[PDB]
Design an enzyme around this catalytic site. Structure first.
Site, PDB file in Angstrom:
ATOM      1  N   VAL A  52      45.313  32.592  33.038  1.00  0.00           N
ATOM      2  CA  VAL A  52      46.259  33.385  33.801  1.00  0.00           C
ATOM      3  C   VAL A  52      46.044  33.124  35.280  1.00  0.00           C
ATOM      4  CG1 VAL A  52      46.990  35.691  34.390  1.00  0.00           C
ATOM      5  CG2 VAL A  52      46.471  35.129  32.039  1.00  0.00           C
ATOM      6  N   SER A  53      44.834  33.387  35.755  1.00  0.00           N
ATOM      7  CA  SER A  53      44.497  33.216  37.156  1.00  0.00           C
ATOM      8  C   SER A  53      43.136  32.545  37.231  1.00  0.00           C
ATOM      9  CB  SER A  53      44.508  34.560  37.892  1.00  0.00           C
ATOM     10  OG  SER A  53      43.456  35.384  37.429  1.00  0.00           O
ATOM     11  N   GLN A  54      42.551  32.558  38.424  1.00  0.00           N
ATOM     12  CA  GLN A  54      41.215  32.028  38.634  1.00  0.00           C
ATOM     13  C   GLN A  54      40.647  32.643  39.900  1.00  0.00           C
ATOM     14  OE1 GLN A  54      40.170  29.470  41.111  1.00  0.00           O
ATOM     15  NE2 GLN A  54      42.119  29.748  42.186  1.00  0.00           N
ATOM     16  N   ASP A  55      39.370  32.369  40.128  1.00  0.00           N
ATOM     17  CA  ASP A  55      38.633  32.866  41.280  1.00  0.00           C
ATOM     18  C   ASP A  55      37.457  31.915  41.470  1.00  0.00           C
ATOM     19  OD1 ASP A  55      37.699  34.366  43.380  1.00  0.00           O
ATOM     20  OD2 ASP A  55      37.645  36.269  42.308  1.00  0.00           O
ATOM     21  N   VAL A  56      36.574  32.239  42.414  1.00  0.00           N
ATOM     22  CA  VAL A  56      35.383  31.425  42.610  1.00  0.00           C
ATOM     23  C   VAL A  56      34.424  31.594  41.439  1.00  0.00           C
ATOM     24  CG1 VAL A  56      33.439  30.982  44.137  1.00  0.00           C
ATOM     25  CG2 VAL A  56      35.678  31.516  45.091  1.00  0.00           C
ATOM     26  N   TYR A  58      34.953  33.506  38.320  1.00  0.00           N
ATOM     27  CA  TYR A  58      35.449  33.720  36.970  1.00  0.00           C
ATOM     28  C   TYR A  58      36.831  33.116  36.771  1.00  0.00           C
ATOM     29  CZ  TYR A  58      37.460  37.642  39.535  1.00  0.00           C
ATOM     30  OH  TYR A  58      38.084  38.419  40.477  1.00  0.00           O
ATOM     31  N   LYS A  59      37.236  33.067  35.503  1.00  0.00           N
ATOM     32  CA  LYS A  59      38.545  32.584  35.089  1.00  0.00           C
ATOM     33  C   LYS A  59      39.018  33.408  33.903  1.00  0.00           C
ATOM     34  CE  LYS A  59      38.234  27.734  36.515  1.00  0.00           C
ATOM     35  NZ  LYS A  59      38.223  26.325  36.041  1.00  0.00           N
ATOM     36  N   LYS A  73      37.503  36.666  29.663  1.00  0.00           N
ATOM     37  CA  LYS A  73      37.041  36.385  31.019  1.00  0.00           C
ATOM     38  C   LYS A  73      35.712  35.660  30.931  1.00  0.00           C
ATOM     39  CE  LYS A  73      35.620  38.739  35.271  1.00  0.00           C
ATOM     40  NZ  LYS A  73      35.377  40.079  35.854  1.00  0.00           N
ATOM     41  N   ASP A 177      36.784  44.757  47.496  1.00  0.00           N
ATOM     42  CA  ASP A 177      38.090  44.163  47.775  1.00  0.00           C
ATOM     43  C   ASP A 177      39.110  44.608  46.735  1.00  0.00           C
ATOM     44  OD1 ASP A 177      37.350  42.878  50.111  1.00  0.00           O
ATOM     45  OD2 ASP A 177      36.774  41.034  49.081  1.00  0.00           O
TER      46      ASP A 177
END
Ligand SMILES: Nc1ncnc2c1ncn2[C@@H]1O[C@H](COP(=O)(O)OP(=O)(O)O)[C@@H](O)[C@H]1O
Lengths: 306, 816
Positions: A52-56, A58-59, A73, A177
């Site tokens: 769906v999304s991503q980050d530094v 996790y995914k 996750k 955040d």
């Protein structure tokens, strides 16, 4: 090869139990343990259009077990290994996401496969995924509508949950955040916060959560992103621009054309009372910001005003 | 406690003489005269432990009479399960009966002239408080002036049990003081402190976990969660040895924002080191000769609510009180004992005379409190002596959970249940009878008045350790132990274990885990008469299905409790041939992915407790073949044939607690919704629908009809939109407590208010974090006559309630 799996299992469950007993006195919510083959089959080895999304760190990934779907996750290895001060936040995420589950505005943790290194979380499949940077699920097609009452309900539904992070328990929690990256959407469009792995001047207080929630509350109403610039150096603040729009343009540009079709009786008086709340929510003086427990009350007062 | 061991052995001979698996054989005639001599022991066993002191020649005789009953039990229960031929068992007990005559005749030269306590059935909760209001206001008013200095320190200096923590907890826990101080911190620091979980016990109510690291990161979260806010810190019972942490913290917390620090301590010479400017040091007072007798009336009678109606004992009630000098816990311990007798002038004057002569040697003042607690221990009934004796093992001022004690007390046979009184109710009236003598004070409750955790006063456990060490039931620092236990991380001791060893418990102080090894864990199964293997919170190094392979050596288990242990997947494969095992508690072990199918076989157990075992595939099929059990929690019935269904629960007539964990609609089969209707002894169901997918789960919960006489229920998640149409005062009249936790429930059906001329008879109600309710408040009070408390926690859209902010913080709403 399988000898590596159980050596993961012993260490990760030892660390997980040592964190959970310290954080909840042992008593928790039912967490169901998956075999790793089920998660590797459910997302086709993390190698498809299921993300769906991503980050530094996790995914996210859409999951499929039999007649029941999930939001897997995982955590990335080589950006955490070597930084143990990030390793303990990895488990702080998976313990806060299992204590916060018995409030309705946090997405429920249905289990945890801990066979992998840096264990892999699972959650309920809220079928409208991650809200994009302006508001609205992407779609199974391509675009969302978001009528105004749905936006107001998702506006106050996050505000209840931030106070559940601040005043519910005998200790406070600083979700550092708040962004609309972190808000999913259930079938009735009820907001479900997530991925609170951060959870920790160079010091964060209670009010820096309010300073984030003000911008998160005006980005839903305007629909223009958190880095708002139209060919003027690619970086200028959305917040000061909304200040000049309130000072000069006077509540005309604040609503997007996507929600230009709610012109029933007044319907903009509560929009005024919501954007004025967003502006007072974002003052520079920390002794003049409204506390978070009053923002949810004032948005309920706004919503019941019709 | 030699009466407390002989009363256990006499009932283990009653239930094996009447068992008639051995009608007439060799070692039965020599057991009936054994019980006929132990029944003649008990005419003079009570005054024996009254005279253990002052006669060592009585002490060794009573110690041998005690130690031989353990060898009597270890050959009684080995011959209970045998049903073979063992000629090497009669002629042992021939000696161990014939040597009891030299263990009574030298005692009968020296004297020369049941187990049911009927004052335990109403619990009283004695926590009243008297004579403090001026002395509470005059140190309120110091804390309302906290801004006038940079930082304020409250120093309480008194003797042992003078009433320091009580006047702390009436100012720390007051409303108009709670408005002034934003946060407030209650920490207990004693000689076992380790100087880190002082800071973690402070930070536990300030936000985040303490990773093991340097002191600077420990101080950073304390400074940023108390950055100029008006806080409050109570550090309690501070001892001067290794005091130097107080200056490592006092130069780190910020001055100049108000607040105060409350430091209670015993010795006077440390109050100057507290540097608290003596006018703001506070020495509490001894009680007046009128308020002391008022507290004595308030405890010792408690049925006429503190009124001496019978005047013949008023003189003796004043005359006992004027011996214990107005010091609070002496008079409250004596009053708690005098609650148990209440009537006869002879029975009052006898223990008045024993309180007078037992006290006559002090040359001290703490010897007064340790004389009156010894009086309260001696004059206690028989089997409660061992019940407070097993409480010695818990560490310094710990918070002791209740089921941890009660499932131990039914473990070693410290309990009694004979004639239809259930073994889980008789396990806790033996706790309420200890909360009546004021030997145990209750700290945590529920909405329904039941008790979760517990603790005892600090001066009491010194008596309990001293009376245990002389009698070899405790002191792990050493070898001779009847019942041992390991506290936080004592694997470096690696304690030698032998054949006595009638129990192992694990005691952790609410947040810590005693990690273990594969070294000493294998040594538990080298024991051969162990009863209570209670290993709670634990990190091992091997899986438990490899560690506990040797339970073939054990046979006399009464309870496992493997709760919150990490490395377990299967219960060990040689649990097949255990026989007794009255309790298998395994709750919160959230990855034991199968329950091993041997628990169909043993017909003995009483408690099967598996709340919130998040991955457990249903309870092998023959669970209706054990007609004795009473507490069945965390059920999870089957799909089609992979376990047992709710039609299997219909047979269990003896149960009273039950907990379902219904997760899919196909778990409940349609032809057996009739199941939960004829359980005549049920008291409290609980339905936990955390994972819940189908829509038929709602239409198959609502047809379950709980019995006519249900006393309590609770609904944990329940994803349905409305009421299940059996929450009506018709179909469950005698319901008295009800609580609804989180979920998606929206409104209540029209039969819920039940507006005939009939009503609810509910006295307690909890409505925690639902988000979509809409019910009125006057409709409740018209429909539900005698509510007392309504604890709503996080439920908005209920603003008709008189709770202060019902959607964002709890309240109680005590009845006017
Ligand atoms: N003024 C009082 N009135 C009634 N009971 C009191 C009073 N002061 C102390 N107590 C009793 O003393 C018992 C424990 O004393 P405590 O204050 O704990 O001693 P310490 O402060 O030395 O630990 C409490 O159970 C309480 O009932």
């Amino acid at each position: 090869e399988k000898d590596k799996a159980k050596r993961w299992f012993l260490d990760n469950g030892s660390i997980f139990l040592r964190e959970l007993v310290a954080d909840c006195n042992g008593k928790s919510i039912p967490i169901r343990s998956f075999s790793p083959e089920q998660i590797l089959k459910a997302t086709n080895n993390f190698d498809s259009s299921c993300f769906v999304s991503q980050d530094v760190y996790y995914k996210w990934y859409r999951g499929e077990i039999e007649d029941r779907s999930y939001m897997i996750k995982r955590f990335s290895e080589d950006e955490i290994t070597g930084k143990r001060h990030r390793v303990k936040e990895v488990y702080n995420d998976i313990v806060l996401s299992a204590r916060m589950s018995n409030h309705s505005n946090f997405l429920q943790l249905l289990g945890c496969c801990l066979e992998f290194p840096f264990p892999v979380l699972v959650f309920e499949f809220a079928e409208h995924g991650a809200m994009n940077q302006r508001g609205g699920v992407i779609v199974n097609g391509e675009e969302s509508l978001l009528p105004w009452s749905v936006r107001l309900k998702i506006g106050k539904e996050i505000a209840n949950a931030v106070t559940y992070l601040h005043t519910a328990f005998p200790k406070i929690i600083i979700h550092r955040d708040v962004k609309p990256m972190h808000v999913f959407l259930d079938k009735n469009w009820t907001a479900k916060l997530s991925d609170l792995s951060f959870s920790i001047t160079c010091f964060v207080t209670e009010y820096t959560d309010v300073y984030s929630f003000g911008i998160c509350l005006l980005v839903i109403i305007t629909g223009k992103p958190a880095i708002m610039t139209i060919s003027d150096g690619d970086l200028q603040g959305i917040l000061s621009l909304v200040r000049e729009l309130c000072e000069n343009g006077k509540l005309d540009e604040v609503i997007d054309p996507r929600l230009m079709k709610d012109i029933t009786s007044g319907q903009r008086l509560q929009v005024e009372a919501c954007v004025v709340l967003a502006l007072r929510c974002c003052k520079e003086r920390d002794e003049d910001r409204p506390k978070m427990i009053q923002v949810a009350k004032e948005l309920k007062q706004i919503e019941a005003s019709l | 406690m030699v009466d407390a061991v002989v009363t256990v052995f006499l009932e283990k001979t009653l239930n094996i003489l009447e068992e008639k698996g051995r009608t007439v054989s060799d070692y039965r005639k020599q057991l009936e005269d054994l019980q006929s001599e132990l029944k003649y022991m008990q005419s003079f066993l009570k005054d024996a432990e009254r005279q253990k002191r002052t006669n060592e020649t009585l002490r060794t005789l009573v110690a041998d009479l005690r130690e031989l009953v353990y060898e009597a039990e270890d050959i009684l229960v080995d011959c209970q399960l045998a049903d073979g031929d063992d000629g090497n068992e009669q002629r042992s007990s021939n000696a161990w009966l014939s040597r009891l005559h030299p263990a009574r005749v030298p005692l009968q030269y020296k004297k020369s002239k049941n187990g049911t306590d009927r004052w335990s059935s109403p619990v009283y909760d004695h926590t009243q408080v008297v004579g403090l209001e001026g002395d509470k206001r005059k140190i309120k008013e110091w804390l309302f002036r906290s801004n006038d200095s940079q930082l304020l320190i409250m120093a309480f200096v008194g003797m042992g049990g003078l009433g320091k923590t009580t006047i702390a907890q009436e100012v720390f826990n007051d409303k108009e003081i709670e408005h002034r101080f934003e946060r407030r911190i209650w920490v207990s620091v004693s000689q076992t402190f380790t100087e880190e979980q002082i800071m973690r016990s402070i930070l536990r109510n300030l936000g985040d976990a303490s990773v093991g690291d340097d002191i600077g990161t420990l101080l950073r979260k304390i400074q940023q969660y108390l950055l100029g806010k008006r806080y409050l810190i109570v550090m309690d019972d501070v001892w001067d040895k290794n005091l130097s942490w107080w200056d490592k913290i006092y130069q780190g917390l910020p001055r100049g924002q108000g607040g105060s620090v409350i430091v209670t301590t015993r010795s006077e010479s440390v109050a100057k080191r507290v540097q608290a400017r003596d006018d703001k040091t506070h020495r509490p007072e001894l009680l007046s000769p009128d308020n002391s007798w008022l507290l004595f009336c308030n405890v010792a009678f408690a049925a006429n609510d503190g009124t001496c109606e019978r005047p013949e004992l008023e003189d003796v009630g004043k005359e006992i009180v004027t011996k214990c000098k107005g010091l609070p816990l002496t008079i409250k311990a004596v009053g708690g004992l005098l609650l148990c007798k209440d009537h006869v002038y002879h029975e009052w004057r006898r223990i008045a005379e024993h309180f007078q002569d037992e006290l006559r040697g002090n040359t001290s003042e703490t010897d007064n409190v340790m004389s009156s607690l010894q009086l309260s221990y001696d004059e206690l009934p028989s089997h409660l002596k061992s019940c407070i004796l097993t409480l010695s093992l818990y560490p310094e001022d710990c918070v002791i959970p209740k089921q941890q004690l009660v499932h131990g007390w039914i473990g070693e046979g410290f309990v009694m249940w004979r004639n239809g009184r259930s073994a889980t109710e008789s396990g806790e009236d033996c706790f309420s009878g200890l909360t009546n003598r004021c030997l145990i004070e209750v700290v945590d409750k529920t909405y329904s008045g039941t008790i979760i955790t517990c603790k005892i006063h600090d001066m009491v456990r010194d008596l309990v350790i001293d009376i245990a060490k002389k009698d070899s039931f405790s002191n792990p620092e050493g070898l001779n132990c009847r019942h041992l236990g390991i506290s936080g991380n004592f694997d470096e001791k690696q304690i030698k274990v032998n054949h006595k060893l009638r129990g192992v418990v694990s005691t952790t102080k609410t947040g810590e885990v005693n990690k273990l090894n594969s070294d000493l864990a294998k040594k538990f199964t080298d024991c051969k008469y162990l009863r209570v293997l209670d290993i709670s919170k634990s990190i091992f190094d091997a899986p438990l299905s490899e560690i506990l392979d040797e339970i073939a050596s054990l046979q006399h288990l009464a309870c496992l409790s493997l709760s919150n242990t990490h490395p377990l997947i299967q219960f060990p494969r040689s649990m097949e041939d255990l026989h007794n095992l009255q309790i298998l508690d395994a709750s919160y072990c959230q990855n034991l992915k199968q329950l091993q199918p041997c628990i169909v076989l043993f017909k003995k157990l009483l408690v099967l407790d598996m709340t919130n075992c998040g991955s457990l595939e249903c309870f092998p099929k023959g669970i209706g073949s054990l007609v004795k059990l009473e507490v069945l929690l965390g059920f999870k019935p089957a799909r089609s044939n992979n376990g047992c269904k709710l039609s299997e629960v219909k047979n269990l007539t003896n149960l009273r607690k039950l907990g379902l964990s219904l997760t899919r609609g196909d778990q409940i089969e349609e032809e057996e919704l009739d199941s939960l209707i004829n359980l005549s002894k049920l008291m409290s169901i609980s339905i936990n629908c955390y994972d819940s997918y189908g829509d038929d789960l709602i239409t198959k919960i609502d047809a379950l009809t709980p019995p006519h006489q249900l006393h309590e229920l609770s609904l944990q998640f329940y994803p349905g939109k409305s009421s299940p149409s059996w929450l009506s005062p018709h179909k469950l009249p005698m319901l008295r407590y009800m609580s609804i936790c989180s979920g998606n429930l929206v409104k209540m059906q029209e039969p819920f208010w039940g507006n005939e001329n009939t009503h609810w008879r509910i006295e307690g109600l909890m409505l925690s974090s639902l988000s979509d309710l809409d019910m009125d408040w006057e409709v409740l009070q018209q429909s539900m006559p005698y509510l007392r408390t309504v604890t709503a926690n996080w439920c908005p859209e209920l603003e008709s309630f008189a709770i202060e902010d019902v959607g964002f913080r709890g309240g109680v709403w005590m009845k006017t």
